[PDB]
Amino acid sequence: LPTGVGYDWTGMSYQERLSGNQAPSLYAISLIVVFLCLAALYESWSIPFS
Amino acid sequence: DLMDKEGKGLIEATLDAVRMRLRPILMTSLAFILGVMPLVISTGAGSGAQNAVGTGVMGGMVTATVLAIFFVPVFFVVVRRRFSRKN
Amino acid sequence: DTAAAIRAELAKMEPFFPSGLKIVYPYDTTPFVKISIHEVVKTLVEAIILVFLVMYLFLQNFRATLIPTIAVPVVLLGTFAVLAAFGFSINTLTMFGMVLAIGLLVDDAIVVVENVERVMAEEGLPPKEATRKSMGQIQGALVGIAMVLS
Amino acid sequence: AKGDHGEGKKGFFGWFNRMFEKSTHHYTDSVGGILRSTGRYLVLYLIIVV
Amino acid sequence: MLELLKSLVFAVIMVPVVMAIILGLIYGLGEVFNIFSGVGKKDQPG
Amino acid sequence: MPNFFIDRPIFAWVIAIIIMLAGGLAILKLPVAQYPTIAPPAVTISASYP
């Protein structure tokens, strides 16, 4: 488009920028804190994996 | 501990404590004095702080080690030998 | 963070500048602080090294030296957790304070690892029996040294 | 081993253990002397305190 | 990374050097503390 | 207190790691700035009569 014209997102569009999908990160930390916290009772190597 | 939990008077107890305990003191202090090495050696990059902190803790770390291992025994004895429960 | 916002606020501007017009940064506090923390982090790492050397040189075993080494990071980052929870920031002062902290804390670990070593070196009892015995003669000291220091 | 302080060990490491253990006897036999002489030490302690 | 090699060399060289000094200091102090071994305390507290 | 962990080796690892994530998260979440504010806050009224 012509020069001097630019753009910005607002409202919902603006929000979806900060983050829309962190699920694969925080489910990942969920998955490790779970891999180990179970063993905090089974006191066992890999037993939680089962 | 050698006094109560084992059967000992002061002098020989002190000598055994201090002899058993001697090494660790150096391990720590060597670890520590060397832990702080960079701060004292450091220069540039706004080195004003870490020099002032490190050369403060270092001098005080030597005299608190080379000198304190001699004097501690005397304090612990004199606080007993001269003012204890004789009974 | 404010400056971090300012480079943002300003990063959107250049494409619509007229010909010949260019930005320049004659006075800037930040790289002082990026560097101030770079320097302390590097003193910390090299300190962890030097500790591991005095540890090897005294316990003369690869295995032994892993123990006190692992325990230091756990303490020091652990501190970020707690001082975050008191509303204190990772500043010039605070971050700088913890190097001294590393120094003090290292021996909290080694005094006990060593003492166990020395205990197993005469009655010759396994690491469990020895470390337990070790806790029995000292553990009480550790809480009080910590109390009085505080 | 029960009783071994690592003297019978290959290389530099043994030298170290011997000269350290030496430094230890020295220090201990020296604290014996210091400990017979409690008083001057208490007041030398005073000179460094001031 | 490269500053790390510097760190390693200073480290390895220094560990013995400082070590010696602090042992040197107690070894020496031990000898002078040997020479000057005093008479005891005073009777006032008793 | 310690003995409990001597028998229970892993559970300690759990404590330590939880602290590792707590601190490692605590950097990523905490403000970074040279100076924790150190001055009496002050407001400034300003006028201009041409």
Swiss-Prot record, chain F:
- Which ranges does the record mark as transmembrane? 10-28
Q: Which residues form a coiled coil?
A: none
Q: Any idea what a deletion of this gene does? A: Loss of susceptibility to contact-dependent growth inhibition (CDI); inhibiting cells still contact the target.
Q: How does it assemble?
A: Homotrimer, with large domains that extend into the periplasm, interacts with AcrA and TolC. AcrA may be required to stably link this protein and TolC. Interacts with AcrZ. Part of the AcrA-AcrB-AcrZ-TolC efflux pump.
| Annotated S-S bridges | none
Report the function annotation for this chain: AcrA-AcrB-AcrZ-TolC is a drug efflux protein complex with broad substrate specificity that uses the proton motive force to export substrates.
Q: From the entire protein, which fragment is shown?
A: 1 to 50 of 1049
Q: Which domain of life is it from?
A: Bacteria
Ranges in the topological domain labelled Cytoplasmic: 1-9
Q: Which organism is it from?
A: Escherichia coli (strain K12)
The protein's name is: Multidrug efflux pump subunit AcrB
Where is this protein found?
Cell inner membrane
**Which family does this protein fall into?**
Belongs to the resistance-nodulation-cell division (RND) (TC 2.A.6) family.
Q: What induces it?
A: Positively regulated by MarA, Rob and SoxS transcriptional regulators (at protein level).
